[PDB]
Structure 1
Amino acid sequence: QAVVTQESALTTSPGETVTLTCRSSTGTVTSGNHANWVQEKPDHLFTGLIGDTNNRAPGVPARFSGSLIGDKAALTITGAQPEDEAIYFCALWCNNHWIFGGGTKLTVLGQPKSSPSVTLFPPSSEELETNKATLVCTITDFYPGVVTVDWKVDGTPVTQGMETTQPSKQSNNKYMASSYLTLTARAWERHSSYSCQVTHEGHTVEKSLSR
Protein backbone atom coordinates (compact mmCIF):
# COMPACT_ATOMS: atom_id res chain seq x y z
CA GLN A 1 0.00 0.00 0.00
CA ALA A 2 2.12 3.00 1.31
CA VAL A 3 1.18 6.43 2.41
CA VAL A 4 3.32 9.44 1.27
CA THR A 5 3.48 12.30 3.69
CA GLN A 6 4.22 15.96 3.12
CA GLU A 7 3.96 19.19 5.20
CA SER A 8 0.50 20.60 4.49
CA ALA A 9 1.43 24.27 4.43
CA LEU A 10 4.79 26.19 4.63
CA THR A 11 5.39 30.05 4.64
CA THR A 12 8.55 31.86 3.54
CA SER A 13 9.63 35.38 2.44
CA PRO A 14 10.98 36.33 -1.09
CA GLY A 15 14.82 35.70 -1.09
CA GLU A 16 14.75 33.08 1.62
CA THR A 17 15.47 29.37 1.34
CA VAL A 18 12.76 26.80 2.16
CA THR A 19 12.85 22.94 2.15
CA LEU A 20 9.82 20.70 1.55
CA THR A 21 10.07 17.02 2.54
CA CYS A 22 8.41 13.79 1.30
CA ARG A 23 8.36 10.68 3.49
CA SER A 24 6.96 7.18 3.03
CA SER A 25 5.27 4.79 5.50
CA THR A 26 7.30 1.90 4.07
CA GLY A 27 10.48 3.35 5.45
CA THR A 28 13.35 5.28 3.89
CA VAL A 29 12.98 6.81 0.46
CA THR A 30 15.72 5.71 -1.90
CA SER A 31 16.86 6.24 -5.45
CA GLY A 32 14.77 3.48 -6.94
CA ASN A 33 11.68 5.46 -5.72
CA HIS A 34 12.55 8.06 -8.34
CA ALA A 35 11.04 10.98 -6.33
CA ASN A 36 9.10 13.32 -8.47
CA TRP A 37 8.07 16.84 -7.57
CA VAL A 38 5.49 18.96 -9.43
CA GLN A 39 3.81 22.33 -9.11
CA GLU A 40 0.18 23.34 -9.16
CA LYS A 41 -0.66 27.00 -9.80
CA PRO A 42 -4.21 28.62 -9.87
CA ASP A 43 -6.46 27.01 -12.44
CA HIS A 44 -5.13 23.46 -12.83
CA LEU A 45 -1.86 24.69 -14.22
CA PHE A 46 0.67 21.95 -13.57
CA THR A 47 4.37 22.08 -14.20
CA GLY A 48 6.82 19.16 -13.73
CA LEU A 49 9.80 20.32 -11.57
CA ILE A 50 12.01 17.44 -10.54
CA GLY A 51 12.29 13.96 -12.01
CA ASP A 52 14.18 10.93 -10.79
CA THR A 53 15.04 12.38 -7.26
CA ASN A 54 17.05 15.46 -8.53
CA ASN A 55 16.76 16.14 -12.25
CA ARG A 56 15.34 19.55 -13.13
CA ALA A 57 12.66 19.22 -15.82
CA PRO A 58 13.04 21.40 -18.99
CA GLY A 59 13.04 25.12 -18.26
CA VAL A 60 12.75 24.91 -14.48
CA PRO A 61 14.80 27.73 -12.80
CA ALA A 62 18.02 26.56 -11.08
CA ARG A 63 16.75 27.75 -7.63
CA PHE A 64 14.70 24.55 -7.56
CA SER A 65 16.70 21.48 -6.61
CA GLY A 66 15.72 17.97 -5.40
CA SER A 67 17.73 15.60 -3.12
CA LEU A 68 17.53 12.86 -0.53
CA ILE A 69 18.07 14.30 3.00
CA GLY A 70 18.33 11.19 5.04
CA ASP A 71 15.41 8.86 4.81
CA LYS A 72 13.36 11.50 2.88
CA ALA A 73 13.11 13.19 -0.45
CA ALA A 74 13.34 17.01 -0.42
CA LEU A 75 12.71 19.92 -2.59
CA THR A 76 14.81 22.98 -1.76
CA ILE A 77 14.03 26.35 -3.19
CA THR A 78 17.18 28.58 -2.80
CA GLY A 79 16.04 32.19 -3.03
CA ALA A 80 12.25 31.88 -3.30
CA GLN A 81 10.32 34.37 -5.58
CA PRO A 82 6.58 35.51 -5.17
CA GLU A 83 5.63 33.36 -8.27
CA ASP A 84 6.63 30.17 -6.35
CA GLU A 85 3.48 30.53 -4.22
CA ALA A 86 1.76 27.27 -5.24
CA ILE A 87 0.94 23.67 -4.29
CA TYR A 88 3.82 21.28 -4.55
CA PHE A 89 3.07 17.57 -4.79
CA CYS A 90 5.71 14.82 -4.45
CA ALA A 91 5.16 11.26 -5.81
CA LEU A 92 7.26 8.09 -5.33
CA TRP A 93 7.52 4.97 -7.61
CA CYS A 94 6.66 2.14 -5.32
CA ASN A 95 5.56 -1.46 -6.16
CA ASN A 96 4.98 -0.39 -9.72
CA HIS A 97 2.62 2.46 -8.73
CA TRP A 98 3.19 6.27 -8.55
CA ILE A 99 1.84 7.19 -5.14
CA PHE A 100 1.20 10.82 -4.29
CA GLY A 101 1.84 12.97 -1.25
CA GLY A 102 -1.04 15.18 -0.04
CA GLY A 103 0.58 18.29 -1.55
CA THR A 104 2.21 21.19 0.37
CA LYS A 105 0.73 24.71 0.14
CA LEU A 106 3.65 27.10 -0.07
CA THR A 107 3.07 30.77 0.65
CA VAL A 108 5.93 33.11 -0.51
CA LEU A 109 5.03 36.44 1.12
CA GLY A 110 4.71 38.81 -1.91
CA GLN A 111 2.71 41.45 0.05
CA PRO A 112 1.72 42.15 3.76
CA LYS A 113 -0.49 39.64 5.59
CA SER A 114 -4.19 40.54 5.24
CA SER A 115 -7.01 39.58 7.64
CA PRO A 116 -10.33 38.39 6.12
CA SER A 117 -13.33 40.59 5.35
CA VAL A 118 -16.20 38.44 6.58
CA THR A 119 -19.84 39.22 5.63
CA LEU A 120 -22.76 37.09 6.80
CA PHE A 121 -26.05 37.56 4.96
CA PRO A 122 -29.54 36.39 6.22
CA PRO A 123 -31.79 34.21 3.94
CA SER A 124 -33.84 36.42 1.61
CA SER A 125 -37.70 36.41 2.15
CA GLU A 126 -38.11 35.13 -1.42
CA GLU A 127 -36.15 32.01 -0.54
CA LEU A 128 -38.04 31.46 2.75
CA GLU A 129 -41.19 31.51 0.70
CA THR A 130 -39.89 28.30 -1.04
CA ASN A 131 -39.63 26.57 2.41
CA LYS A 132 -35.82 26.93 2.45
CA ALA A 133 -33.18 28.97 4.22
CA THR A 134 -29.59 29.50 3.11
CA LEU A 135 -27.10 31.54 5.07
CA VAL A 136 -24.17 32.90 3.18
CA CYS A 137 -20.77 33.75 4.67
CA THR A 138 -18.41 35.43 2.18
CA ILE A 139 -14.75 35.74 3.17
CA THR A 140 -12.52 37.97 1.07
CA ASP A 141 -9.16 39.71 0.99
CA PHE A 142 -7.17 37.39 3.26
CA TYR A 143 -3.49 36.51 2.86
CA PRO A 144 -1.89 33.96 3.43
CA GLY A 145 -4.60 31.92 1.61
CA VAL A 146 -5.38 29.54 4.49
CA VAL A 147 -8.63 29.73 6.43
CA THR A 148 -10.85 27.60 8.74
CA VAL A 149 -14.57 28.22 8.78
CA ASP A 150 -16.89 27.08 11.59
CA TRP A 151 -20.65 27.51 11.94
CA LYS A 152 -22.52 28.04 15.23
CA VAL A 153 -26.34 27.95 15.65
CA ASP A 154 -27.35 29.27 19.13
CA GLY A 155 -23.89 28.45 20.35
CA THR A 156 -24.06 24.73 19.27
CA PRO A 157 -21.40 23.61 16.70
CA VAL A 158 -22.86 22.79 13.28
CA THR A 159 -21.70 19.44 11.94
CA GLN A 160 -23.96 18.83 8.92
CA GLY A 161 -25.65 21.04 6.30
CA MET A 162 -22.78 23.33 5.43
CA GLU A 163 -20.64 23.71 2.33
CA THR A 164 -17.26 25.73 2.10
CA THR A 165 -15.38 26.48 -1.20
CA GLN A 166 -11.63 25.82 -1.32
CA PRO A 167 -9.74 29.22 -1.11
CA SER A 168 -9.54 30.92 -4.48
CA LYS A 169 -7.03 33.56 -5.65
CA GLN A 170 -8.22 37.12 -6.27
CA SER A 171 -6.81 39.36 -9.03
CA ASN A 172 -4.93 41.41 -6.44
CA ASN A 173 -3.43 38.06 -5.23
CA LYS A 174 -5.28 37.98 -1.92
CA TYR A 175 -7.69 34.99 -1.49
CA MET A 176 -11.47 34.53 -1.15
CA ALA A 177 -13.87 31.75 -0.09
CA SER A 178 -17.58 31.29 0.66
CA SER A 179 -19.46 29.09 3.08
CA TYR A 180 -23.11 28.13 3.15
CA LEU A 181 -25.49 26.90 5.92
CA THR A 182 -28.66 25.49 4.36
CA LEU A 183 -31.66 24.89 6.64
CA THR A 184 -35.40 24.32 6.05
CA ALA A 185 -37.46 27.50 7.03
CA ARG A 186 -38.74 25.43 10.02
CA ALA A 187 -35.23 24.72 11.41
CA TRP A 188 -34.45 28.40 10.67
CA GLU A 189 -37.38 29.56 12.83
CA ARG A 190 -36.37 27.30 15.75
CA HIS A 191 -33.19 29.23 16.61
CA SER A 192 -32.35 32.87 17.41
CA SER A 193 -28.64 33.38 16.84
CA TYR A 194 -26.38 32.29 13.95
CA SER A 195 -22.60 32.64 13.62
CA CYS A 196 -19.98 32.30 10.96
CA GLN A 197 -16.53 31.97 12.53
CA VAL A 198 -13.44 32.36 10.40
CA THR A 199 -9.97 31.63 11.81
CA HIS A 200 -6.97 33.10 9.97
CA GLU A 201 -3.37 32.92 11.36
CA GLY A 202 -4.45 31.98 14.87
CA HIS A 203 -6.98 34.86 15.11
CA THR A 204 -10.77 34.43 14.86
CA VAL A 205 -13.12 36.79 13.04
CA GLU A 206 -16.78 36.05 14.02
CA LYS A 207 -19.88 37.41 12.28
CA SER A 208 -23.33 36.74 13.91
CA LEU A 209 -26.97 37.55 13.31
CA SER A 210 -30.29 37.01 14.97
CA ARG A 211 -33.62 36.03 13.51
Structure 2
Amino acid sequence: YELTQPPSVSVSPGQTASITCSGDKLGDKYACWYQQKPGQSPVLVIYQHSKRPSGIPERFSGSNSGNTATLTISGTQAMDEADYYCQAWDSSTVVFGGGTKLTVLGQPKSSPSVTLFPPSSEELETNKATLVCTITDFYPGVVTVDWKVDGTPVTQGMETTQPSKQSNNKYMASSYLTLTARAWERHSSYSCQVTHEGHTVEKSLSR
Protein backbone atom coordinates (compact mmCIF):
# COMPACT_ATOMS: atom_id res chain seq x y z
CA TYR A 1 0.00 0.00 0.00
CA GLU A 2 1.02 3.67 -0.41
CA LEU A 3 1.54 6.20 2.39
CA THR A 4 0.24 9.70 1.75
CA GLN A 5 0.68 12.97 3.59
CA PRO A 6 -0.10 16.58 2.81
CA PRO A 7 2.56 18.24 0.57
CA SER A 8 2.53 21.37 2.76
CA VAL A 9 1.76 22.30 6.36
CA SER A 10 2.40 25.83 7.61
CA VAL A 11 2.30 27.36 11.08
CA SER A 12 3.57 30.47 12.80
CA PRO A 13 6.37 30.19 15.39
CA GLY A 14 4.92 28.95 18.66
CA GLN A 15 1.97 27.20 17.06
CA THR A 16 1.53 23.47 17.02
CA ALA A 17 2.17 21.71 13.70
CA SER A 18 0.25 18.55 12.85
CA ILE A 19 1.47 16.29 9.99
CA THR A 20 -0.62 13.21 9.20
CA CYS A 21 0.36 10.07 7.28
CA SER A 22 -2.33 7.60 5.99
CA GLY A 23 -2.31 4.22 4.25
CA ASP A 24 -4.46 1.15 3.80
CA LYS A 25 -2.80 -1.09 6.38
CA LEU A 26 -0.88 1.48 8.31
CA GLY A 27 -2.65 0.74 11.60
CA ASP A 28 -1.19 -2.76 11.63
CA LYS A 29 2.33 -1.25 11.69
CA TYR A 30 4.51 1.07 13.71
CA ALA A 31 5.04 4.43 12.06
CA CYS A 32 8.21 6.45 12.30
CA TRP A 33 9.12 9.92 11.15
CA TYR A 34 12.17 11.53 9.60
CA GLN A 35 13.16 15.15 9.45
CA GLN A 36 15.21 16.21 6.42
CA LYS A 37 16.69 19.64 5.71
CA PRO A 38 18.07 20.68 2.31
CA GLY A 39 21.32 18.92 1.41
CA GLN A 40 21.25 16.89 4.64
CA SER A 41 20.63 13.27 5.55
CA PRO A 42 17.37 12.26 7.21
CA VAL A 43 17.09 12.25 10.99
CA LEU A 44 14.82 9.91 12.96
CA VAL A 45 12.62 12.12 15.18
CA ILE A 46 9.87 9.69 16.24
CA TYR A 47 9.52 5.91 16.13
CA GLN A 48 6.83 3.46 17.27
CA HIS A 49 4.25 6.22 16.75
CA SER A 50 5.23 8.31 19.79
CA LYS A 51 8.80 7.66 21.05
CA ARG A 52 11.73 10.09 20.72
CA PRO A 53 15.30 8.88 20.35
CA SER A 54 17.89 10.52 22.64
CA GLY A 55 18.77 14.06 21.61
CA ILE A 56 15.44 14.85 19.85
CA PRO A 57 13.73 17.88 21.43
CA GLU A 58 10.72 17.22 23.66
CA ARG A 59 8.45 19.30 21.41
CA PHE A 60 8.35 16.42 18.89
CA SER A 61 5.64 13.88 19.65
CA GLY A 62 3.45 11.48 17.79
CA SER A 63 0.12 9.70 17.83
CA ASN A 64 -1.99 7.43 15.73
CA SER A 65 -5.64 6.74 15.04
CA GLY A 66 -7.27 4.36 12.59
CA ASN A 67 -4.95 3.81 9.63
CA THR A 68 -3.30 7.20 10.21
CA ALA A 69 -0.25 8.41 12.12
CA THR A 70 0.45 11.99 13.11
CA LEU A 71 3.63 13.88 13.96
CA THR A 72 3.03 16.85 16.22
CA ILE A 73 5.49 19.69 16.97
CA SER A 74 4.33 21.65 20.04
CA GLY A 75 5.68 25.19 19.97
CA THR A 76 7.23 25.24 16.53
CA GLN A 77 10.57 27.00 16.04
CA ALA A 78 12.03 28.46 12.84
CA MET A 79 14.68 25.65 12.91
CA ASP A 80 11.89 23.07 12.50
CA GLU A 81 11.22 24.15 8.91
CA ALA A 82 12.07 20.99 7.00
CA ASP A 83 10.63 18.07 5.05
CA TYR A 84 9.06 15.34 7.19
CA TYR A 85 8.55 11.77 5.92
CA CYS A 86 6.60 9.00 7.57
CA GLN A 87 7.74 5.41 7.08
CA ALA A 88 6.36 1.96 7.70
CA TRP A 89 6.28 -1.34 5.79
CA ASP A 90 3.86 -3.63 3.98
CA SER A 91 3.85 -7.33 3.04
CA SER A 92 7.12 -7.14 0.97
CA THR A 93 8.65 -3.64 1.20
CA VAL A 94 9.54 -0.59 3.28
CA VAL A 95 7.18 2.28 2.42
CA PHE A 96 7.85 6.03 2.75
CA GLY A 97 5.24 8.73 2.60
CA GLY A 98 5.67 11.38 -0.10
CA GLY A 99 6.85 14.03 2.39
CA THR A 100 5.39 17.17 3.90
CA LYS A 101 7.23 20.47 3.85
CA LEU A 102 6.63 22.23 7.16
CA THR A 103 6.93 25.96 6.57
CA VAL A 104 7.38 28.06 9.71
CA LEU A 105 5.89 31.33 8.53
CA GLY A 106 8.39 34.25 8.32
CA GLN A 107 6.31 36.52 6.05
CA PRO A 108 2.68 36.92 4.97
CA LYS A 109 1.08 34.19 2.88
CA SER A 110 0.93 34.97 -0.82
CA SER A 111 -1.10 33.17 -3.49
CA PRO A 112 0.54 32.23 -6.80
CA SER A 113 0.39 34.45 -9.89
CA VAL A 114 -0.15 32.13 -12.84
CA THR A 115 0.51 32.74 -16.56
CA LEU A 116 -0.10 30.17 -19.32
CA PHE A 117 1.65 30.46 -22.69
CA PRO A 118 0.74 28.57 -25.88
CA PRO A 119 3.30 26.91 -28.18
CA SER A 120 5.06 29.26 -30.58
CA SER A 121 4.41 28.91 -34.32
CA GLU A 122 8.19 28.34 -34.57
CA GLU A 123 8.04 25.29 -32.33
CA LEU A 124 4.98 23.88 -34.15
CA GLU A 125 7.03 23.77 -37.40
CA THR A 126 9.07 21.03 -35.60
CA ASN A 127 6.06 18.71 -34.97
CA LYS A 128 6.22 19.51 -31.23
CA ALA A 129 4.23 21.78 -28.91
CA THR A 130 5.13 23.02 -25.41
CA LEU A 131 2.77 24.92 -23.14
CA VAL A 132 4.50 26.88 -20.36
CA CYS A 133 2.80 27.66 -17.05
CA THR A 134 4.75 30.14 -14.98
CA ILE A 135 4.02 30.48 -11.28
CA THR A 136 5.36 33.36 -9.19
CA ASP A 137 5.08 35.22 -5.89
CA PHE A 138 3.84 32.34 -3.73
CA TYR A 139 4.50 31.67 -0.05
CA PRO A 140 4.75 29.13 1.48
CA GLY A 141 6.94 27.63 -1.21
CA VAL A 142 4.96 24.55 -2.18
CA VAL A 143 2.46 24.14 -5.02
CA THR A 144 0.79 21.24 -6.77
CA VAL A 145 0.26 21.57 -10.51
CA ASP A 146 -2.45 19.81 -12.48
CA TRP A 147 -2.98 20.02 -16.24
CA LYS A 148 -6.23 19.43 -18.13
CA VAL A 149 -6.83 19.09 -21.87
CA ASP A 150 -10.50 19.35 -22.97
CA GLY A 151 -11.44 19.04 -19.30
CA THR A 152 -9.60 15.70 -18.89
CA PRO A 153 -6.69 15.38 -16.45
CA VAL A 154 -3.38 14.84 -18.22
CA THR A 155 -1.12 12.11 -16.80
CA GLN A 156 1.76 12.22 -19.35
CA GLY A 157 4.20 14.72 -20.88
CA MET A 158 4.50 17.15 -17.97
CA GLU A 159 7.49 18.36 -15.96
CA THR A 160 7.41 20.89 -13.12
CA THR A 161 10.44 22.63 -11.67
CA GLN A 162 11.37 22.60 -8.03
CA PRO A 163 10.26 25.87 -6.38
CA SER A 164 12.98 28.51 -5.98
CA LYS A 165 13.36 31.73 -4.06
CA GLN A 166 12.82 35.09 -5.70
CA SER A 167 14.64 38.32 -4.77
CA ASN A 168 11.60 39.40 -2.71
CA ASN A 169 11.91 36.11 -0.79
CA LYS A 170 8.69 34.56 -2.12
CA TYR A 171 8.85 31.48 -4.41
CA MET A 172 8.46 30.69 -8.08
CA ALA A 173 8.19 27.61 -10.26
CA SER A 174 7.27 26.65 -13.81
CA SER A 175 5.49 23.72 -15.40
CA TYR A 176 5.69 22.39 -18.98
CA LEU A 177 3.21 20.27 -20.97
CA THR A 178 4.82 18.81 -24.09
CA LEU A 179 2.54 17.48 -26.82
CA THR A 180 2.96 16.48 -30.44
CA ALA A 181 1.90 19.18 -32.92
CA ARG A 182 -0.96 16.91 -33.97
CA ALA A 183 -2.25 16.46 -30.37
CA TRP A 184 -2.05 20.24 -29.94
CA GLU A 185 -4.24 20.74 -33.04
CA ARG A 186 -6.80 18.06 -31.95
CA HIS A 187 -7.73 19.72 -28.67
CA SER A 188 -9.33 23.09 -28.00
CA SER A 189 -9.02 23.78 -24.25
CA TYR A 190 -5.85 23.68 -22.11
CA SER A 191 -5.62 24.47 -18.42
CA CYS A 192 -2.87 24.86 -15.82
CA GLN A 193 -4.27 24.53 -12.29
CA VAL A 194 -2.04 25.48 -9.36
CA THR A 195 -3.06 24.49 -5.81
CA HIS A 196 -1.57 26.43 -2.92
CA GLU A 197 -2.79 26.57 0.71
CA GLY A 198 -5.96 24.61 -0.23
CA HIS A 199 -7.09 27.00 -2.99
CA THR A 200 -6.58 26.56 -6.73
CA VAL A 201 -5.55 29.34 -9.19
CA GLU A 202 -6.33 28.37 -12.78
CA LYS A 203 -5.33 29.77 -16.20
CA SER A 204 -6.68 28.41 -19.49
CA LEU A 205 -6.25 28.75 -23.26
CA SER A 206 -9.07 28.04 -25.74
CA ARG A 207 -9.08 28.13 -29.59
**TM-score using structure 1 length:** 0.70
Matched, 1:170 2:165: yes
Q: 1:121 to 1:37 in 2, by over 3 A?
A: same
Q: After the TM superposition, which of the residue ranges 78-87 and 39-48 deviates more from structure 2?
A: 39-48
Matched, 1:189 2:185: yes
Could you tell me how far apart the structure 1 residues matched to 2:188 and 2:52 are? Answer: 60
Matched, 1:55 2:73: no
Tell me if the contact between 2:5 and 2:20 (Cα under 8 Å) persists in the aligned partners: yes
Give the superposition deviation at 1:115.
Answer: 1.0
Question: For the aligned residues, what is the CA RMSD?
Answer: 3.6
Tell me if the contact between 1:20 and 1:75 (Cα under 8 Å) persists in the aligned partners: yes
The unaligned stretches of length 5 or more in structure 1 are none
Could you tell me which residue of structure 1 aligns to residue 152 of structure 2? Answer: 157
Could you tell me how far apart the structure 1 residues matched to 2:28 and 2:109 are? Answer: 37
Listed as ranges, the matches of 1:20-35 within 5 Å are 20=19, 25=25, 27=27, 33=30
Tell me if the contact between 2:158 and 2:175 (Cα under 8 Å) persists in the aligned partners: yes
SS in 2 for 1:139: strand
**TM-score using structure 2 length:** 0.71
Listed as ranges, the matches of 1:9-28 within 5 Å are 9-20=8-19, 25=25, 27=27
Give the superposition deviation at 1:80.
Answer: 0.6
Listed as ranges, the matches of 1:34-113 within 5 Å are 36-43=32-39, 45-50=41-46, 53-58=50-55, 60=56, 62-67=57-62, 75-92=71-88, 99-113=95-109
Number of equivalences: 202
Could you tell me how far apart the structure 2 residues matched to 1:115 and 1:149 are? Answer: 14
Matched, 1:126 2:122: yes
Tell me if the contact between 1:167 and 1:175 (Cα under 8 Å) persists in the aligned partners: no
Could you tell me how far apart the structure 2 residues matched to 1:43 and 1:146 are? Answer: 18
Could you tell me how far apart the structure 1 residues matched to 2:148 and 2:65 are? Answer: 45
The unaligned stretches of length 5 or more in structure 2 are none
Tell me if the contact between 2:111 and 2:196 (Cα under 8 Å) persists in the aligned partners: yes
Could you tell me how far apart the structure 2 residues matched to 1:187 and 1:94 are? Answer: 40
1:147 to 119, 123, 143: 143
Could you tell me how far apart the structure 2 residues matched to 1:70 and 1:187 are? Answer: 47
Give the superposition deviation at 1:173.
Answer: 5.1
Q: 1:183 to 1:102 in 2, by over 3 A?
A: closer
Q: 1:5 to 1:97 in 2, by over 3 A?
A: closer
Larger Rg: 1 or 2? Answer: 1
Could you tell me how far apart the structure 1 residues matched to 2:110 and 2:65 are? Answer: 37
